[model samples]
Target: EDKYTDKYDNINLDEILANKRLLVAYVNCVMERGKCSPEGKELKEHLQDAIENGCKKCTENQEKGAYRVIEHLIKNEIEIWRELTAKYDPTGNWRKKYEDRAKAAGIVIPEE
Candidate 1:
């Protein structure tokens, strides 16, 4: 699946990582009942780090971090994230780091 995994290179991964932190914040917003707080503010800072510094050479942070971020969005609402995840990867395995991302969201298994 070079077409899919190959996109996980330096450039692409940085793009994902750059957004991961804020994406996490956005997820936390609704997941935690819209009481946006300190954590979201801090994670926003991390996302800014990537944007300002042009990201790192390594793809680890971006790829896996994106997994949890996207997973959180999906486990909460499959329709929303199913479309979102498919845009990034069509293999249908949005969570490569785990069986599914529900754990990251502190939830149980979800049906796709």
Candidate 2:
């Protein structure tokens, strides 16, 4: 709920509703290139750019504590991806997914 512009704008969270639709609705990174190639390099760059843009859109002009939404969202997305990946990929390469998911979930695997 927003509190300034329309009413759903995250810009003035805890203040007013601006009725603005939230951004970051799409991902620049597909996370499943599944192929290695010169074209893959370009795709990776494009995905990174999209993610960055989404981050900016979500946090732009946000009030304090509001911008965390972007980080939090990214974290969730990564975690979900990890879970899904593990369910499908049993190899160790994707095990990095565990590290990523742990970081996002606020837990370190080798912490104990």
Candidate 3:
């Protein structure tokens, strides 16, 4: 099968990460707390599949971009990260893997 679309590959992660309003818009969209843009909706659609399968369908840029976003959230936006994980990985199965990886990287993830 083909990879996920690259339409959003060029999105500016730095811009969003630097702007709380922009960042929260995406979080809200994914958490179903607000309306979704087309890009946000696309993310929502693949969120579970990507989390479960390590982003097998992600384009190279998509994978890299996701990693940056996740790292930023874990380090700088802990509350949002916790909320996202709680909603997406309520069982903590997938989250445990990330927590382990974070620990190895010397990033302590607080309990949810």
Candidate 4:
């Protein structure tokens, strides 16, 4: 079974979430509003497919890391989360599914 490279699974997502500069840089890179680091570029490359197909290619740690990142962004950095949702799921299809999952996970999504 093929999977995305797990080279980045060890990245400290907690550190990134705690640092506004780093967080926004990643958001901007994924949103195509700024330059991308190699990791960010890889994320951008796979984001749409992952969102659509439920991260079928992600490694175990990658999927867990993704959920953590999503949870953090949806809970704490909502504006950035909205931007990402708009870009990745403009039709609200996948967003609806993810919103349901978030609610089930005990994360309260702001009504939009």
Clashes of each: 0, 14, 0, 0
- Candidate 2: stretches off by over 4 Å: 1-4, 8-25, 29-66, 79-112
Query: What's the distance in Å from true for residue 18, model 3?
Result: 2.9
The 0-to-1 C-alpha lDDT of every candidate, in the order given, reads 0.42, 0.35, 0.59, 0.58
For candidate 4, the 10 contiguous residues with the lowest summed lDDT are 1-10
Error of 4 at 32 (Å): 2.4
Error of model 3, residue 64, in angstroms: 2.3
List, residue by residue over 70-111, the lDDT tens digit for candidate 1. 554455443334332322234334344433454555554345
Question: What local lDDT score does residue 5 receive in model 3, on the 0 to 100 scale?
Answer: 47
lDDT of 2: 0.35
lDDT of 3 by residue, 1-112 (tens): 3343445643445666887676767776666655554557665555555544547566566555666666776666544455555466565554565566567766664664
Off by over 4 Å in 3: 1-12, 36-39, 46-59, 90-97, 101-112
TM-score ranking of the models: 3, 4, 1, 2
TM-scores across all candidates?
0.30, 0.22, 0.55, 0.54
Whose lDDT is greatest here? 3
Residue-wise lDDT of candidate 4 within 1-112, one digit each (tens)? 2333445643445656776677767776666654554557655555555544556665566556665666677666554445555366564664565567666766653555
> Model 4: which residue pairs collide?
none
What residue runs in model 4 are displaced by over 4 Å at the alpha carbon? 1-15, 36-39, 46-57, 90-97, 101-112
